From Swiss-Prot, chains A, B:
GO cellular component, as recorded: cytosol
Name assigned to this protein: Alcohol dehydrogenase E chain
Residues with the N-acetylserine modification: 1
EC numbers for this chain: 1.1.1.1
Organism in which the protein naturally occurs: Equus caballus (Horse)
UniProt-annotated binding residues for NAD(+): 48, 199-204, 223, 228, 292-294, 319, 369
Protein origin, superkingdom: Eukaryota
Cofactor(s) it depends on: Zn(2+)
Catalytic activity: a primary alcohol + NAD(+) = an aldehyde + NADH + H(+); a secondary alcohol + NAD(+) = a ketone + NADH + H(+)
Residues annotated for Zn(2+) 1 binding in this entry: 46, 48, 67, 174
Length: 374, 374
């Protein structure tokens, strides 16, 4: 009934920075060759979406944001082979083209077709499928999930189990997989190790899940909001510390607590200072620190390279280092097999029309993940 | 015969920064418990010794420098069990106490007993074995090899093959092992990979040796002194580039040359800017950059953490990541079995008495390693 036709539907359009989303009617073009049009079922509110609002993350405006989601294929363009109308799917904000040097490399996941490094806010072919009040609207990360319908390139979508609960597994599209993979795949946390996790939001809690799954003996949560500590302990933190409680820098505190530095630290906030602190608190000869948070655009940190010369390793990753199209269906299968839990991350479930209220909960510190339902 | 007695001998004392060494008589006390007094046979001139002169590497003055050396045990203190008088030995500027958390860790080598992090310029017991003009003189990195005799703690000396040629294997005490291990142990260079090596001195040439040994397909040497290129090619560089020849920054050149960034890069100079350039030139999703050079004291670099967030790994190491006391005798055994060559590193030989000429050769750019003979 809609295949081949322009769809008019509701989306949340961001017309300019530092404004509420506008919930209004948009036109969604049909998919061109190698494109997929998805009916959205559920989408999470990630801090990275708020970064677009705040100007922390720069991407062309006006835009349809949203990148953590799940939905059902409405139609496919010519030449699509990996999904069919009716399939449950998760959009992939890091694509997997399968052809580039990164996709071919055993470790890399930051596919060269990404729209992260040099954001264009379009489909692969450099155009947009969205119109609103007669004006073209940009895509975001090739996904644009804050809309009843989106169009994505085939390399930016994965088919998942037909029985999966979309209102939970949307989190595999960003927050859960990013944190969990940062621990198990990027850091490669070891059994019996001591971990420090800076930032106890949806992503940091998922890092904790991964550290516990990996067998860490101690997992120290760090957050300036002590209301975040109870849930961090539920999912595996052994101890939580608030930097504001101490008269000395928290890297010194964590170094003392761990009798000379932690084995693994994770920055899961997005601040230059905590990136350096998290590096410093890992053991100087063999510690590993992983940057997960997204910092403000175009700002450099300052650090003393002796922190590295003694033996520390510093790395970062997008999407937990997971090759996105290969990994997403397997993560959903693992969820269906009860290998990990997603409910601990979900604090609020709201209709899509309450998107602004959902962002206000995040900004105020009150929520972990709000899932919006279409 | 000299056991238990003070030895008067010649050493090269550095009384103040930015002045020639003074070759003059010092008094060397006998070894206390768990100390070893060594008659030096050969010592190399490493750029880190020059860093003491220049104030790049800060350690208490006046001082007897020198850390890349080999000699013969003259006497042992009470309780020493790992060397005997007459044994050939290499002093270990990074100790291996065998008891601390780092020594017990499978990967770590920066032993907590080191005198690098918070330099005191003493023996383990906080005192000095050197007197000159009636004044106490500091040790350097627990080794102080610019002296006809030195005293070192037992954890800072390794017994080596009785037949080894000390005028060659002194290089295993620093420059060869540092560079080679940075490639084979720290970076873990893989077969068929592309490597970039910044700085083609003694240590950078040893990194090239390691990259070639590990099977790299391309090894790009980078130096502003084109006179360094011929020897770099002899030990395995496939191409060399001088940043001075280009209008574009060399990270851009190297990214172009490697069709999108190198697999492994190494900073082997000691400049903040080239540390950042070397990180930038490795591939953004899966590249690894290793800092080997020693930066100017207390100075911070500035960098954009997005370089890490895409997936790069940044690390550093002292002494090529080798656990020193375990590794040095094995490296000497491998040299004796022709598993690697040291002669390409040695461009000049001088008597100890011409130490200042040896430093002039390093500073002029003419030498790689000058070996000084006692
Ligand atoms: N890498 C990748 O991929 C990624 C990234 N991301 C990031 O991360 C971060 C985080 O997120 P989330 O979790 O979502 O957030 P929230 O919830 O908001 O949480 C946070 C936390 O933190 C804390 N804090 C603050 N501040 C501070 C703290 N702590 C401590 N200290 C301080 N100072 C609070 O409280 C909370 O709790 C961010 O940054 C983001 O962005 C994510 C994800 C992923 N992505 C990327 C993308 I381009 C998209 N997505
Ligand atoms: N880590 C460890 O352990 C170490 C370190 N270290 C260091 O390193 C470096 C290097 O050294 P050497 O090799 O000896 O030096 P030389 O010979 O001088 O070489 C260098 C080079 O570079 C170059 N450049 C300059 N500038 C530049 C360049 N290139 C490029 N760019 C630029 N800009 C020149 O020309 C030459 O050739 C240093 O830093 C040192 O220090 C060593 C060893 C080891 N240690 C440590 C220690 I305490 C002691 N030892
Ligand atoms: Zn790709
Ligand atoms: Zn996200
Ligand atoms: Zn130790
Ligand atoms: Zn050295």
């Amino acid at each position: 009934s809609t295949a081949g036709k322009v769809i008019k539907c509701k989306a949340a359009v961001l017309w300019e920075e530092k404004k509420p989303f506008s919930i209004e009617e948009v036109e969604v073009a049909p998919p061109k060759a190698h494109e997929v049009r998805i009916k959205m079922v559920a989408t999470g509110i990630c801090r990275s979406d708020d970064h677009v609002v705040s100007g922390t993350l720069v991407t062309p405006l006006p835009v349809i944001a949203g990148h953590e989601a799940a939905g059902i294929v409405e139609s496919i363009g010519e030449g699509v082979t990996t999904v069919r109308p009716g399939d449950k799917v998760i959009p992939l904000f890091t694509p997997q083209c399968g052809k580039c040097r990164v996709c071919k490399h055993p470790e890399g996941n930051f596919c060269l077709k990404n729209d992260l490094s040099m954001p264009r806010g379009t489909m692969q072919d450099g155009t947009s499928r969205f119109t609103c009040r007669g004006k073209p609207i940009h895509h975001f990360l090739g996904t644009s999930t804050f809309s009843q319908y989106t169009v994505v390139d085939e390399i930016s979508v994965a088919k998942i189990d037909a029985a999966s609960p979309l209102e939970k597994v949307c989190l595999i599209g960003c927050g859960f997989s990013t944190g969990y993979g940062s621990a198990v795949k990027v850091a490669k946390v070891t059994q019996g190790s001591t971990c420090a996790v800076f930032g106890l939001g949806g992503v940091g809690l998922s890092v904790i899940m991964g550290c516990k799954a990996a067998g860490a003996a101690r997992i120290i949560g760090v957050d300036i909001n002590k209301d975040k500590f109870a849930k961090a302990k539920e999912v595996g933190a052994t101890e939580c510390v608030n930097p504001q409680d101490y008269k000395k820098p928290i890297q010194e505190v964590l170094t003392e607590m761990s009798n000379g530095g932690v084995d693994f630290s994770f920055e899961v906030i997005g601040r230059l200072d905590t990136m350096v602190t998290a590096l410093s608190c890992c053991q100087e000869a063999y510690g590993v620190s992983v940057i997960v948070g997204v910092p403000p655009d175009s700002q450099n940190l300052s650090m003393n390279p002796m922190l590295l010369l003694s033996g520390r390793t510093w790395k970062g990753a997008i999407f937990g280092g997971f090759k996105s199209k290969d990994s997403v269906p397997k993560l959903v299968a693992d969820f269906m097999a009860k290998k990990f839990a997603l409910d601990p991350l979900i604090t609020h479930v709201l209709p899509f029309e309450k998107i602004n209220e959902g962002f206000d909960l995040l900004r105020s510190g009150e929520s972990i993940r709000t899932i919006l339902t279409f």
